[PDB]
């Protein structure tokens, strides 16, 4: 087809180019083998140069555009056409060749971005960039940022014309162009770091004003993978041109780095500075900015060993602290607290070098009256003591150097706060302790011991009212000393009000003398553990003394002492802590129940925690190991304290969220996210063993994310990781097919579960010959089977029986079971039929095989179970009291509470007889005035003991009866079901692995609560496009409607829009690809108020017509969604 | 109010419009003052093109906003 | 607006699109009915190929428009 391009008739070449197009378009490299590119490209350029007829021009540039997609081995010849390509950009005659020539070069700039640049094409592509359409602009700005890369520094004259253009492109909003503008400058600065001459010309006053205003923009126009290389661009400026670093401090870099990290710049100096959740790669860069805005440190003096730590110039910044002393003040008085919080929170190896080293630079270059003003509300004193006592090299050395300089500049304050926080002792411990890469460590050890020896000799060879009071009142808590009540009222006054250190508590022996004060199990003590623990809770809870138990309930008032005790104990945990974070860095059995009526006794759970030794699943050696075991004892007394009393409420002392250790949280969250940990499975053994034994240190999201990694194979764990943090980039799994009826639901459900629990693969639900396949039916399956398992004809659950709307089409409804407090199982007596029973024990085997398979495939199940159902699942059934009857059967439990008042008034007057037992009238009604016999009230076919229905419950067996009610209703009558429920659960997946969780926090393991549905989250996560903006009329009308649904219209909307009726892991942000909102097309004769927003759920569009008002779109959505 | 319209030659004209007055009303005003057929009259404002149905208030045009004018030939 | 998509084998599939759908959409509503990923595919509409950011209203492609498809050899 070659010589037709060589024709003399201009319409003949116009015909032959379209033959030459589709020869190369629909072919490929396999089919077009032998295509003579060596002649066609000089032909197409000659056809391109015929500038009079634009159609000869247009298809010629389309023909070269497609040749590289036909032959990637031909792109070496295409490079010759670049001046003629740019010739149509220099003087534009046909704009559809101009937008065509850009996409010809945007393919070339991946391999030949120098050849454009040597041809001067950087100024040419950006020249008429105001005119093109968006797909052509995104071509040229990606021709720009490719040509900004391989520049020899002699060639600045190419870029230098274009620089006020690209500095304006940081104000556009097209997100693939702004992230092609920022790629250009951050490839300039990486090539102009050796020349302060040009780097002062790259950085204008406007480049450092736009990029500064770019990062404050909420929602982030930049990605989180570009917010790095914007901020890292500032680093290779300031470490090679200090004048720009001066100029960044001139242009208010403080309110930038305050707003990026302290959240909203809310005017007030935040005491609890809230961190915006940033990655462990962004915080390494938002501090290597702050590390290079303060002057460099000397290499002689006390800093002289810093030549060795990295063995693994009249500064204008130094003039800036002189030439503008208020600019250093306004830098440091606000941006120090960032470096305070960022260092203390995270657990990076390399972040904690860099956040440390910028506190060296702030302290060493502040003067005396600045550090007195900055460090005034920052406990740096205790903070060094942790850094002093590390097992790392650089964190000890940098603690010494801050210990050196703080004593020099301020000895009138930091001599007090280096003895009352253990800085003196730990350095003195460093001086007196004795014992290439193997070389450098001992010289640092040689450096530290000498530097510690100089330090005490200079400052602490000279020579505590609170450590008096805490070494003394510790040893009135001895085992063999009757300290009375006031040996803790002192500690109620020491730990609450007066400032204590975390070195006084650490070494006045106060930790082990409260572990042993509460968990001592010998008769050699002066005071028994019953009397001690009730004195203890008289101090930290204001519960009554032994013998002062009043007539009413044990009435809590306020937990504020034990609240304060845990926090100061948890502060002492934080500083003493040394757990490693391995991150791979990249810088006939006589039934006395039935024959007699003898219940097994209430097993107090508290008696397993109150043990002084560690439990035998703790195998980690810790300097703070004694502080954990005080909290585990302090968590058990916070939670299970009502057992020690009688009428104490089911109202725990301190909520389990308060015990969350904010450093141990953060050291875990960074530990869980490393992918080389999980595929190899070598989780650090301090993490799991803390989780099971002390779950209360962690927030619920952590333990949940902890649970889905420890308990499974090399495959399902990593899939959980990608569901929550999608920025890594899903192993080989299996999904064996099944097929399910919509009307033979339950019987086929028990058939699929019967032979698909054994393998460790995923479950495939697919209806009987229906179009919708994928995650649509499977997450509808468990919402149907859970709709199925509350049928009143199955006879499984307690509670009332209510006919509901049944939107699923089952218009019979079968009178579904709904309880206000939750669904606990039904009691069976011994008078139940052996076929009525073994039918039920195939449902609770199924229900256990349901909820176990509900977890391994990450699904959810909507069963509003009662609270004491979960206690039976975590094996806490032996502890259930009359405060667990109230969360199952809220009519009986008013009778059981009002009859234990008779039982507690039985033992009141028995101690002081036979006539007084008859006078016990509950609202004028005695025991026989109820007329109750040994049958569970509400299940009269169930006799409690043998023939107890013939046995009237009287005052002489009421104590036996209220044990027998609560044992049958909560323990015995329900026991036959659960012995299969705990068996069916454990057929695949053991119930030990659920011990990370609690009773009241397994509801949120398989239900959820659903997610964010305000407009602010919708704005940051939806991507309006192809006709709509964030200020369009429909998108403003859409997002106001989505914040006014119930919890089912949200399920309706996602059913129609996304496909599945519930949001995936983490709000809208994890939708792949995210929610696109396109305006729907019509013609001129069509009113858009009479149409429906049809969609495509495979890539999640919402082709929304622009309805005229807000209520019309409100009505069309509910119609278009419910129509499946 | 009034807006600015550029072109590929460089001459900037000034229409007299309101937050109203849709594209075919005002790209006819191009032909009313430049004699250019609206078959090929592309309008570009901040990169995105201007389809025929929507207004100028729907495109968030402020006073003396700069947009552009572009001649296609027949293609799409 | 029902359209058509023809592959190399002539296996003419159909789609039920709007004119307001995009080109990466109908790059991936053919993902449903053959196993060829959205980066190995070139939709061709009578000589030109199609940008990955345009709608179908802007291309003036309408009902019964028999386009084409070529496997991009990755």
Curated annotation (Swiss-Prot), chain A:
> Which keywords appear in this protein's UniProt record, sorted alphabetically?
Acetylation, Autism spectrum disorder, Disease variant, DNA damage, DNA repair, Intellectual disability, Nucleus, Phosphoprotein, Transferase, Ubl conjugation pathway
Which intervals of the chain form a coiled coil? none
> EC annotation?
2.3.2.26
Q: Does the keyword Disulfide bond apply?
A: no
What is its pathway?
Answer: Protein modification; protein ubiquitination
User: What residue stretches are annotated with the HECT domain?
Assistant: 1024-1124
Q: What is its main location?
A: nucleus
Q: Mention one GO biological process in which this protein takes part, according to its record.
A: DNA repair
GO cellular component terms given for this protein = cytosol; nuclear speck; nucleoplasm; nucleus
The positions flagged as active site in the entry are: 1098
Cell location: Nucleus, Nucleoplasm
Write out the ranges of the annotated region (K-box).
Answer: 652-726
Reaction(s) catalysed by this chain, per the record, are: S-ubiquitinyl-[E2 ubiquitin-conjugating enzyme]-L-cysteine + [acceptor protein]-L-lysine = [E2 ubiquitin-conjugating enzyme]-L-cysteine + N(6)-ubiquitinyl-[acceptor protein]-L-lysine
Task: Tell me where on the tree of life, at the top rank, the source sits.
Answer: Eukaryota
Alphabetized GO MF terms: nuclear thyroid hormone receptor binding; ubiquitin protein ligase activity
Q: What does this protein do?
A: E3 ubiquitin-protein ligase involved in ubiquitin fusion degradation (UFD) pathway and regulation of DNA repair. Part of the ubiquitin fusion degradation (UFD) pathway, a process that mediates ubiquitination of protein at their N-terminus, regardless of the presence of lysine residues in target proteins.
The record's similarity note reads:
Belongs to the UPL family. K-HECT subfamily.
Quaternary structure (record):
Interacts with MYC; leading to disrupt interaction with isoform p19ARF/ARF of CDKN2A. Interacts with TRADD; leading to disrupt interaction with isoform p19ARF/ARF of CDKN2A. Interacts with SMARCC1; leading to disrupt interaction with SMARCE1.
Name the associated disease, please: Clark-Baraitser syndrome: An autosomal dominant disease characterized by intellectual disability, delayed psychomotor development, behavioral abnormalities, variable dysmorphic facial features, tall stature, obesity, and macrocephaly.
Question: In its UniProt entry, what is this protein called?
Answer: E3 ubiquitin-protein ligase TRIP12
| Organism this protein belongs to | Homo sapiens (Human)
Where in the full protein does the shown chain start and end, and how long is the full protein? 442 to 1985 of 1992
Curated annotation (Swiss-Prot), chain B:
Source organism, top-level taxon? Eukaryota
Q: Where is this cross-link: Glycyl lysine isopeptide (Lys-Gly) (interchain with G-Cter in ubiquitin)?
A: 6, 11, 27, 29, 33, 48, 63
Q: What is the effect of changing residue 74 to K?
A: No effect on ADP-ribosylation
Q: Which residue positions does UniProt flag as site: Interacts with activating enzyme? A: 54, 72
Q: Where is this site: Essential for function?
A: 68
Q: Where is the Ubiquitin-like domain?
A: 1-76
Q: What subcellular compartments does it reside in?
A: Cytoplasm; Nucleus
Give the result of residue 76 to A, as annotated.
Loss of ADP-ribosylation
Where (Microbial infection) ADP-ribosylthreonine occurs along the chain? Answer: 66
- Cross-link Glycyl lysine isopeptide (Gly-Lys) (interchain with K-? in acceptor proteins), sequence positions: 76
- What is known to happen upon mutating residue 68 to G? Loss of DTX3L-mediated polyubiquitination of histone H3 and H4
- Residues bearing PTM Phosphoserine: 65
PTM note says: Phosphorylated at Ser-65 by PINK1 during mitophagy. Phosphorylated ubiquitin specifically binds and activates parkin (PRKN), triggering mitophagy. Phosphorylation does not affect E1-mediated E2 charging of ubiquitin but affects discharging of E2 enzymes to form polyubiquitin chains. It also affects deubiquitination by deubiquitinase enzymes such as USP30.
In this UniProt entry, the residues modified to ADP-ribosylglycine are 76
Function comment: Exists either covalently attached to another protein, or free (unanchored). When covalently bound, it is conjugated to target proteins via an isopeptide bond either as a monomer (monoubiquitin), a polymer linked via different Lys residues of the ubiquitin (polyubiquitin chains) or a linear polymer linked via the initiator Met of the ubiquitin (linear polyubiquitin chains).
Listed name of the protein: Ubiquitin
**Which organism is the protein's source?**
Homo sapiens
Identify the segment of the full-length protein shown.
1 to 76 of 156
